[PDB]
Design a binder for this molecule. Structure first.
Ligand code: HEA
Ligand SMILES: CCCCC/C=C\C/C=C\C/C=C\C/C=C\CCCC(=O)O[C@H](COC(=O)CCCCCCCCCCCCCCCCC)COP(=O)(O)OCCN
Ligand SMILES: CCCCCC/C=C/CCCCCCCCCC(=O)O[C@H](COC(=O)CCCCCCCCCCCCCCC)COP(=O)(O)OC[C@@H](O)CO
Ligand SMILES: CCCCCC/C=C\CCCCCCCCCC(=O)O[C@H](COC(=O)CCCCCCCCCCCCCCC)COP(=O)(O)OC[C@@H](O)CO
Ligand SMILES: CCCCCCCCCCO[C@@H]1OC(CO)C(O[C@H]2O[C@H](CO)[C@@H](O)[C@H](O)[C@@H]2O)[C@@H](O)[C@H]1O
Ligand SMILES: C[C@H](CCC(=O)O)[C@H]1CC[C@H]2[C@@H]3[C@H](O)C[C@@H]4C[C@H](O)CC[C@]4(C)[C@H]3C[C@H](O)[C@]12C
Ligand code: CUA
Ligand SMILES: [Cu+2]
Ligand SMILES: [Mg+2]
Ligand SMILES: [Zn+2]
Lengths: 144, 259, 57, 227, 71, 49, 75, 46, 513, 93, 84, 43, 104
């Protein structure tokens, strides 16, 4: 039961798949019937009942393999909370866009962009693959 | 109660006063260079001297007076001093690098030659050669000092160490006079820059080393050193040889090959 | 001169609980106070100077 | 120039730039491959309940993961170094142009024949003509003949700058007291843009480079007209 | 009665099987890469220049009014 | 005894995800951010000279 | 003459000494002629090469210093 | 000697979690804030 | 209080002071980074022209490198762990150790002074002249910056002397160097790099100081000097500096990966030692890969390309040995392990883009562009930082005696992972397509990648704020440690959590056999 | 003459170490102990000044991995890796 | 200097061996690669009968007295020029 | 690692308070400066 | 050394008549670090050692770790139990499944 901080220099109990027989028993102090049980254990194990066998297991070890190895729902909390905080980050960006960011330059206006685009096409910006390559100069349209 | 041989040092205020002194000296140079005042600087130099004084005083208390320097502790101090000297060598290396970079490819502004047009170097056979013999000589006398100490001879130790110190002092006075007599200055392009900055830091180390030798002198006077245990003296001797060797490199590089 | 090292050893090994930097006696306390006062005073001064320098003149 | 959402290099305008594109494809393939091998092996190590926790002998697998990488580096160095020495070969320019960096603009000198020189300043944003590019245009462009080998010499008259034109694969630092050489050859007419590529103070962002590449005859008349 | 299964070196066996898999997958990606990226690029540049006419290109640019030096 | 995750796991995940998607979709499309996507296939070029 | 030819004495990226050397050569040559009182046009190649390679501010500054008596090179 | 053990080997008190909150807030908060105020300082300068 | 915290001669307490200072520096550096991305997150001018912008860029770098990473890794984890991992009673020079600490807050103060006087030092953390000279940067800022670096240099040079001496001289007599854990190796190698590199930096910035104040002309062509000489002297230190920044991280990673794989030892211990030493040696002969556009002769450029690439070999041995350590582990998915695994992959990516940059022919186009910024934030803001966060969550219970909430730490990892990748991945695109470094504004074409990169940085901000709350929660809840696995191969834990003030007063017993 | 020797002038711990070494003793753990055969009849005897001391076991020559554990006063304990036996022999200096 | 290495804890065979295989032989292997690379004969230069070269003040004590001890027909011309 | 249960438990509510106070301490001072940027700069 | 020699060393290790409790733990904790599920004859010898040590609990734990070491190879554990049946019966050892200890 009770593990104590002043016991740290002493061998301790652990449930680990790769360390199946820990350095000490889970429970060391024994009641009267638990003491009788350990005596009964010195005789044929066939005479032990199921409940007795379980009790001996639970004195020696805390959790069984199936218990110590079980999966959990923790992943739901981690992914959900992460998304929640990432969502909260978007609030910060909204506030910044609203109170800090002035108007962007006039060169992003739709008409400027259409004109800049034609000029880029007239000077043949990136004509091999990048940009003008995607315009059809014969049909005067974007390559379909 | 410890059962190792290492030294647990009493809580000390000197690391902090040392650090604050570093702040006062750097802020002080800023104020000097840019705000026409020397006040911070003078305070900083002062606290720095007091820090070194008390810190090293304490190391003496701990060793000579309290016996904390076991062989294992002394062995660390030996490593400590070797490493510190290595870092100083690297420091000088940066200045020798600068010197060779500028002198080996003299630019058009210099006339494309080394020494530059309009520079008249000192004659390396004159006071620079005398300086060279002075520092080599002091390396001989400090070795006599060391052997006298290990042979338990107090008088000859003190006399050899005195000679060693006097030679350091002489070198320093010779250099100061040479600095005054030199017809070029720190502002004479890269020639004056490399010359004065490299030999100036060297001169600073000679002063530091001579001071360390003088500390050893007075400790010897007070019977601190035993014939077998005298690390302060060994360290000052290693540093002293470091100072001599750096001179040899400067003499060969700047005074002789660079003339 | 004479060897007074033993007397120094006696003094600095005295079991009075004092840190090494103060163990010499009252002079240590004064030198410490002078040093610490210069460092702390000079440090406040450096901050005044930073305040001053942080604005145009 | 760069276009919106560009992922890779600007299209090559010179044979050396095309060379760099292919070398980069070659190297990037190795990069993607190694990083995906590492991500994969990691996921592999981490997806089994089987254990083996006893001391393991390294005295052989270290051969593999030391020789393989050695071989890969060589497969990179070979073409890398062929290109390096390519860009160093003797070529014989027809024309030499100097550019001098300044805070914050470039000046250009074409002094093979006449004394032609001029300053080249960014077009301020409020003065852009419709369809012009913010931060990229200059009042006076660097007119040059196309399909010809040009020696560019680069220096500065104040702080560091660096003279760059990505589509030609060019970047040469501008250092006061020094005269750095690079060669330039455009396969195509057009306008080719770059930007100052060494921090140089308040308007580092705003001293661009525009080359205008045209037939020699137009370049000659342009030169004459700028005297 | 159940047959005896392999009981030894199960980790090493998974390891070998998947390393060989990763190898095969890597050559499949290289093949794919120097086909959809490298060759594609070499061929765009080759195709573009095979019959490129720089004067004609210049003439279009000049007529669109892009040049300071050529109207 | 069910722990925090058995109790709240499902709600944390569902509401975390729903909120994140909502606010990011809103930030991205509704407050005037300039993404400057490519004009390829979207812009009609227009006479500039 | 189109521009300065490749010069195997200065094959690298730093061309500073190429400009300097040819500037020296031209004014040395010029002095040799002008002296032994003769034909300065024999020096033309050096003047072409350095005008091609050398920044205008460098030439101008070196000219000013030659006139001033402070040019640090030997002519 | 000095106090030893959890919450005692540190220069700040963790005896009260709300006082600790205030302290950590001023500590981390002053660090994060400082560049904003230096920028402002510089802008309000010219 | 003053005796303990201002006059310390204890390795644990001084480590704790370094951790607090580096954590505070971390918040400063973060704020600077957000100012950068706030400016870049929309086209146009937010803060002012390039001067104030690059004052921020410059301070961001100096704070992250000199005040966050080095103190945390070397002053903090180094002081706490190194003496414990070798069973030593303290560092060799416990009082000199305290001065290395106390030099740092004055250094940081000088950096703050620089940004407050005049117009700040808008020079780049490389401080190149002539921009950094007395004409283009007249007044006290650059000198305040030089002095700040001098103090930080002295702090690390004395620290390095302390670490090498301690690690050479204070092992149990039976312990050879080949029986010390990889973290101790990593700290010693790092200290040798500091010892040799910082004094070259000191010489070079001292020459800058005298050019600015004593009319020397080391870097001024008018006196026969050369701006390029400064570059050589700086980078002769600067490249080792980056190995100094990652090596203690490699050491931690090794301990973390071994530990959460349930292994008693790292795969190929002697290959790991070989790799760190090789990387340390190679790190001194490659500096001019930072100067490929300055106009260097071609053979010189061929050598620096080849020498730089060779570092991939030892580095690849470490990466593969971490993988081999995982192999067959009983894998524990702790938050620390997640930081370590993220480290392995992301460091690798960043190392590989370093290999791209090593190719001087390509570097012509990549130099001084965001491709370089992407390279180095992968190795620093993922590499160095992930190693730090991993070490921090792993050893927090050793240092404090309390546990963190593992669920919260996992959430913090997830947020950070998304943020940093969103920040830096798109910068590869910006670099390839030619956006330059140290720009307050960019041509409109670059808008999209910059907007997304800036959103990334805000996500990292949220993670940073969450970390602070997580540390608070740990101290507020006081879950005291009881039991820790694998102490037989992790000596630093064997004295309990937190260890007593004095440990190893009676040294360990180790037979020679 | 005139120069003190260590015999005459060495003090504090330095003196203790010097005298103890004279007597072939190692109360300050300067030297590495030599292993016995490590059996239960012939355990490595581990001196201590309390009732527990940390032991590091280099199981085989040249192992880089050291095995660390508290040795307590009482029955001999075994290294959890190689099983060699150790026994605390507490108290003194 | 210190190099970048580190060890030193104790001077032993193991350290020197570690340096032999981990530094020294790898260095030789690299230099071997570098040579097994720049190898490949070179375009021998035109013969010029310079009087300061191909010295003959006395016949060599072997062969026909006019061939140097390690004469290489491909790169060492005689005083009268190359052979074939 | 194993640990004891918290000596001074922090409930969901107390954590909400700690988290909110933490975030505000970073966000408010910065928000104030940025918000008044126009007035500092765009003077 | 062959597989058979490996198995034989381990059978012998656990078969030592006066094997103590430390040696039993050391044996199983070492064995499960290998890349293998122990042969039935090895497990048989360790179970018999549990009996001589009067430790029923460890015998059951040993069966759990056999199952654990097989990882996703679900056919291994049933085979080994099938092979151990006579020993289980002889010694009165109940399986983790018979004891309900396979439940999460
Ligand atoms: C922690 C920091 C850190 C680290 C570890 C590195 C590591 C490396 N760096 Fe980086 N670097 C920086 C920080 C760092 N760097 C900074 C801050 C700058 C800019 C400074 C400034 O200008 O302000 C910079 C700049 C920089 C440049 C300059 C680009 C330019 O300015 O033009 C170059 C190019 O050579 C470079 C190269 C490398 C290489 C080859 C490595 C290698 O060490 C990486 C080796 C690792 C791997 C290769 C991955 C693992 C290996 C394998 C999985 C094996 C298989 C791999 C292969 C076969 C390739 N770095
Ligand atoms: C005979 C030996 C003399 C020793 C030195 C004497 C006086 C200076 C004091 C200390 C010198 C220390 C370092 C050297 C620094 C600068 C140059 C000093 C060398 C020197 O003394 O040069 C003199 C000029 O010095 C000058 O500017 C005077 C400058 C005075 C202020 C010193 C500069 C302070 C800045 C140093 C920064 C220190 C950085 C160190 C960091 C290390 C690691 C952190 C030469 O005189 P000149 O008239 O130009 O020519 C002579 C013509 N008749
Ligand atoms: C203008 C006039 C003054 C100029 C000011 C410039 C500064 C000058 C400072 C000069 C250096 C003085 C050093 C004094 C050290 C005395 C303390 C000491 O030497 O301590 C010794 C230990 O070594 C130790 O710490 C060795 C300690 C290391 C000493 C380091 C010395 C170099 C300092 C470098 C500072 C210069 C900065 C460099 C510039 C770039 C004590 O042990 P032992 O000697 O074995 O004694 C024990 C026996 O008695 C027992 O039998
Ligand atoms: C631009 C202006 C910048 C200003 C920066 C200067 C800042 C501060 C200067 C003032 C501080 C100096 C005060 C005295 C310091 C003495 C340090 C010392 O002497 O440290 C010794 C260890 O280092 C050793 O030996 C060997 C190492 C000794 C080094 C001496 C310390 C001075 C170093 C300053 C110069 C930096 C180095 C430059 C390298 C390029 C002793 O170690 P402690 O832990 O104390 O004791 C251990 C006990 O067992 C002793 O009994
Ligand atoms: C780069 C890191 C930054 C991340 C983004 C920060 C986003 C959240 C910051 C919130 O900060 C507050 O926001 C205000 C408004 O929303 C403020 O009120 C300002 O405006 C109020 C109303 O509009 C006035 O009443 C007040 O006086 C006040 O000045 C302002 O003070 C500030 O503290
Ligand atoms: C006073 C002392 C003799 C008594 C003693 O040993 O304590 C002697 C021995 C060595 C002497 C010193 C050495 O002879 C070296 C110096 C010689 C100079 O002529 C006088 C000062 C000088 C430094 C001497 C001063 C003093 O007389 C010393 C120190
Ligand atoms: Cu000019 Cu940047
Ligand atoms: Cu580098
Ligand atoms: Mg650059
Ligand atoms: Zn052992």
């Amino acid at each position: 039961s009770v593990v104590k901080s002043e016991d740290y220099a002493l061998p301790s109990y652990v449930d680990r798949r790769d360390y199946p027989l820990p350095d000490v028993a889970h429970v060391k102090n024994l009641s009267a019937s638990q003491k009788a049980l350990k005596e009964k254990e010195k005789a044929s194990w066939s005479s032990l009942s199921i409940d007795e066998k379980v009790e001996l297991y639970r004195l020696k070890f805390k959790e069984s393999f199936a218990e110590m190895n079980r999966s959990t729902n923790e992943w739901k909390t981690v992914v959900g909370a992460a998304m929640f905080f990432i969502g909260f980050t978007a609030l910060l960006l909204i506030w910044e866009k609203h109170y800090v960011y002035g108007p962007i330059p006039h060169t992003f206006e739709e008409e400027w962009v259409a004109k800049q685009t034609k000029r880029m096409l007239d000077m043949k910006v990136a004509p091999i693959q990048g940009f003008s390559a995607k315009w059809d100069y014969d049909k005067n349209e974007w390559k379909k | 109660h410890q059962t190792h041989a290492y030294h647990m040092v009493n809580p000390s205020p000197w690391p902090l006063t040392g650090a604050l002194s570093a702040l006062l000296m750097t802020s002080g140079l800023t104020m000097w260079f840019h705000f026409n005042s020397m006040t911070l600087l003078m305070i900083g130099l002062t606290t720095n001297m007091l820090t070194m004084y008390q810190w090293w005083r304490d190391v003496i208390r701990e060793s000579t007076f309290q016996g904390h320097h076991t062989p294992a502790v002394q062995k660390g101090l030996r490593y400590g001093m070797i490493l510190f000297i290595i870092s100083e060598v690297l420091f000088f290396t940066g200045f020798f690098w600068a010197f060779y970079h500028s002198s080996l490819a003299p630019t058009p502004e210099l006339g494309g030659c080394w020494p530059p047009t309009g520079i008249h170097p000192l004659n390396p056979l004159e006071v620079p050669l005398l300086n060279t013999s002075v520092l080599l000589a002091s390396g001989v006398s400090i070795t006599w000092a060391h052997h006298s100490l290990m042979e338990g001879d107090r008088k000859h130790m003190l006399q050899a160490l005195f000679i060693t110190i006097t030679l350091g002092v002489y070198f320093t006075l010779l250099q100061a006079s040479e600095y005054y007599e030199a017809p070029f200055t720190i502002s004479d392009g890269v020639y004056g820059s490399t010359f004065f900055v490299a030999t100036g830091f060297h001169g600073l180390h000679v002063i530091i080393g001579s001071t360390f030798l003088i500390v050893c002198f007075f400790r010897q006077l007070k019977f601190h050193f035993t014939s077998n245990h005298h690390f302060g003296f060994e360290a000052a001797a290693w540093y002293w040889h470091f100072v001599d060797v750096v001179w040899l490199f400067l003499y060969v590089s700047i005074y002789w090959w660079g003339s | 001169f004479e060897n007074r090292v033993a007397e120094k050893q006696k003094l600095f090994q005295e079991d009075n609980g004092l840190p090494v930097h103060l163990k010499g006696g009252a002079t240590d306390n004064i030198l410490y106070r002078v040093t610490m006062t210069l460092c702390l005073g000079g440090t406040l001064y450096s901050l005044y100077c930073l305040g001053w320098a942080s604005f145009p003149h | 120039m760069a276009y919106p959402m560009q992922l890779g290099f600007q299209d090559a305008t010179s044979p050396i730039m095309e060379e760099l594109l292919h070398f980069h494809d070659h190297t990037l393939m190795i990069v993607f491959l190694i990083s995906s091998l590492v991500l994969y092996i990691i996921s592999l190590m981490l997806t089994t309940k089987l254990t083996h926790t006893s001391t393991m002998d390294a005295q052989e697998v270290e051969t593999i993961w030391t020789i393989l990488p050695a071989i890969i580096l060589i497969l990179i160095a070979l073409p890398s170094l062929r290109i390096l020495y390519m860009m160093d070969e003797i070529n014989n320019p027809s024309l030499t142009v100097k550019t001098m960096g300044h805070q914050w603009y470039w000046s250009y000198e074409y002094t093979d024949y006449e004394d032609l020189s001029f300053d080249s300043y960014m077009i301020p944003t409020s003065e852009l003509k419709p369809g012009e590019l913010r931060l990229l245009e200059v009042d006076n462009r660097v007119v040059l003949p196309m399909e010809m080998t040009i020696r560019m010499l680069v220096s500065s008259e104040d702080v560091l700058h660096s003279w760059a034109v990505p589509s030609l694969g060019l970047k040469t630092d501008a250092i006061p007291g020094r005269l750095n050489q690079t060669t330039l050859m455009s396969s195509r007419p057009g306008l080719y843009y770059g930007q100052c590529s060494e921090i140089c103070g308040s308007n580092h962002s705003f001293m661009p480079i525009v080359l205008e590449l045209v037939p020699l005859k137009y370049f000659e008349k342009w030169s004459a007209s700028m005297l | 009665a159940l047959a005896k299964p392999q009981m030894r070196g199960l980790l090493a066996r998974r390891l070998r099987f998947h390393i060989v898999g990763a190898f095969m997958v890597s050559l499949g990606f290289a093949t794919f890469y120097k086909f959809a990226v490298a060759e594609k690029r070499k061929k765009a540049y080759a195709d573009f220049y095979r019959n490129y006419d720089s004067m004609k290109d210049f003439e279009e640019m000049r007529k669109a009014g892009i040049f300071q030096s050529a109207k | 005894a069910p722990d925090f995750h058995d109790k709240y796991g499902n709600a944390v995940l569902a509401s975390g995800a729903t909120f994140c998607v909502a606010v990011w979709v809103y930030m991205a499309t509704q407050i005037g951010i300039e993404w400057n996507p490519s004009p390829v296939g979207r812009v009609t070029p227009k006479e500039w000279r | 003459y189109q521009t300065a030819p490749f010069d195997s004495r200065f094959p690298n990226q730093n061309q500073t000494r190429n400009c300097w050397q040819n500037y020296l050569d031209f004014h040395r040559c010029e002095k040799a002629m002008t002296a032994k009182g003769g034909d300065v046009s024999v020096c033309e190649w050096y003047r072409r090469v350095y005008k091609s390679l050398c920044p205008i501010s460098w030439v101008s500054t070196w000219d000013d210093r030659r006139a001033e008596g402070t040019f640090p090179g030997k002519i | 000697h000095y106090e030893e053990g959890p919450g005692k080997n540190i220069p700040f008190s963790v005896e009260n979690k709300w006082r600790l909150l205030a302290m950590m807030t001023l500590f981390f908060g002053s660090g994060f804030a400082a560049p904003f105020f230096i920028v402002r300082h510089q802008l309000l300068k010219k | 209080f003053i005796n303990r915290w201002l006059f310390s001669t204890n390795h644990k307490d001084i480590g704790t002071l370094y951790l607090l200072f580096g954590a505070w520096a971390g918040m400063v550096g973060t704020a600077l980074s957000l100012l950068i991305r706030a400016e870049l997150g929309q086209p146009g001018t937010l803060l002012g022209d390039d001067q104030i912008y690059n004052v921020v860029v410059t301070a961001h770098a100096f704070v992250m490198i000199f005040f966050m990473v080095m103190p945390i890794m070397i002053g903090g984890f180094g002081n706490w762990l190194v003496p414990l991992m070798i069973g030593a009673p303290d560092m060799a020079f416990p009082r000199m150790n305290n001065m290395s600490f106390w030099l740092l807050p004055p250094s940081f103060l000088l950096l703050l002074a620089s940004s407050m006087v005049e117009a700040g030092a808008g020079t780049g953390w490389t401080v190149y002249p002539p921009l950094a000279g007395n004409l283009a940067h007249a007044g006290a800022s650059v000198d305040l910056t030089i002095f700040s670096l001098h103090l930080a240099g002295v702090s690390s040079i004395l620290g390095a002397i302390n670490f090498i001496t301690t690690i050479i001289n204070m092992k149990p007599p039976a312990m050879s160097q080949y029986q010390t854990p990889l973290f101790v190796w990593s700290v010693m190698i790092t200290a040798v790099l500091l010892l040799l590199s910082l004094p070259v930096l000191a010489a070079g910035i001292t020459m800058l100081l005298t050019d600015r104040n004593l009319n020397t002309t080391f870097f001024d062509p008018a006196g026969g000097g050369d701006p390029i000489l400064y570059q050589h002297l700086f980078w002769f230190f600067g490249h080792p500096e980056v190995y100094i920044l990652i090596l203690p991280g490699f050491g931690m990673i090794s301990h973390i990966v071994t530990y959460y794989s349930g292994k008693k030892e790292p795969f190929g211990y002697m290959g790991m030692v070989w790799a760190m030493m090789s990387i340390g040696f190679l790190g001194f002969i490659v500096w001019a890969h930072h100067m490929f556009t300055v106009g260097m002769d071609v053979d010189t450029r061929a050598y620096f390309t080849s020498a730089t690439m060779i570092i991939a070999i030892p580095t690849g041995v470490k990466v593969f040995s971490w993988l081999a350590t995982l192999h067959g582990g009983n894998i524990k998915w702790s938050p620390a392990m997640m930081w370590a695994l993220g480290f392995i992959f992301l460091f690798t990516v960043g190392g590989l883009t370093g290999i791209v940059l090593a190719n001087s022919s390509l570097d012509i186009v990549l130099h001084d562009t965001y491709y370089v910024v992407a390279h180095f934030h992968y190795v620093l803001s993922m590499g160095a930082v992930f190693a730090i966060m991993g070490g921090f969550v792993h050893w927090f219970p050793l240092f404090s005696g309390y546990t963190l909430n593992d669920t919260w730490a996992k959430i913090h990892f997830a947020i950070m992972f998304v943020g940093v990748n969103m920040t830096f991945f798109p910068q590869h695109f910006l670099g390839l397509s030619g956006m330059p470094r140290r720009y307050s504004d960019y041509p409109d074409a670059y808008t999209m990648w910059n907007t997304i990169s800036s959103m990334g940085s805000f996500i990292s901000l949220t993670a940073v704020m969450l970390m602070v709350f997580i540390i608070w929660e740990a101290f507020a809840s006081k879950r005291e440690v009881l039991t820790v696995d694998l102490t037989t191969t992790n000596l630093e834990w064997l004295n309990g959590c937190p260890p007593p003030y004095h440990t190893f007063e009676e040294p360990t017993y180790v037979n020679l056999k | 003459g005139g120069v003190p020797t260590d015999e005459e002038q060495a003090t504090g711990l330095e003196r203790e170490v010097m005298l103890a070494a004279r007597k072939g003793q190692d109360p300050y753990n300067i030297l590495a102990p030599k292993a016995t055969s490590g059996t239960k009849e012939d355990p490595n005897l581990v001196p201590s000044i309390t009732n527990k001391r940390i032991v590091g076991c280099i199981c085989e020559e040249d192992n880089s991995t050291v095995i660390w554990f508290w040795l307590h006063k009482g029955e001999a304990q075994r290294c959890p890796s190689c099983g060699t036996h150790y026994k605390l022999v507490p108290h003194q200096l | 200097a210190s190099a970048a290495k580190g060890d030193h804890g104790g001077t032993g065979a193991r350290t020197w061996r570690f340096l032999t295989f981990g530094l020294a032989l790898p260095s030789v292997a690299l230099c071997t690669l570098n040579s097994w690379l720049h190898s490949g004969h070179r375009e021998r230069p035109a013969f010029i009968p310079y009087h300061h070269l191909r010295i003959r003040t006395k016949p060599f004590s072997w062969g026909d007295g006019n061939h140097t001890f390690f004469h290489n027909p491909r790169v060492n011309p005689l005083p009268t020029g190359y052979e074939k | 690692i194993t640990a004891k249960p918290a000596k001074t438990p922090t409930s969901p509510k107390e954590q909400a308070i700690g988290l909110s106070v933490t975030f505000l301490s970073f966000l408010l001072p910065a928000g104030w400066v940025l918000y008044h940027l126009d007035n500092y700069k765009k003077s | 050394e062959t597989d058979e020699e490996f198995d034989a060393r381990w059978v012998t290790y656990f078969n030592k008549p006066d094997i103590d409790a430390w040696e039993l733990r050391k044996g199983m904790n070492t064995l499960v670090g290998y890349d293998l599920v122990p042969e039935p004859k090895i497990i048989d010898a360790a179970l018999r050692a549990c009996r001589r040590l009067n430790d029923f609990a460890s015998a059951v734990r040993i069966l759990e770790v056999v199952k654990d070491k097989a990882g996703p190879h679900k056919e291994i554990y049933p085979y080994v139990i099938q092979e151990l049946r006579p020993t289980l019966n002889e010694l009165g050892i109940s399986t983790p499944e018979e004891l309900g200890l396979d439940k999460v």
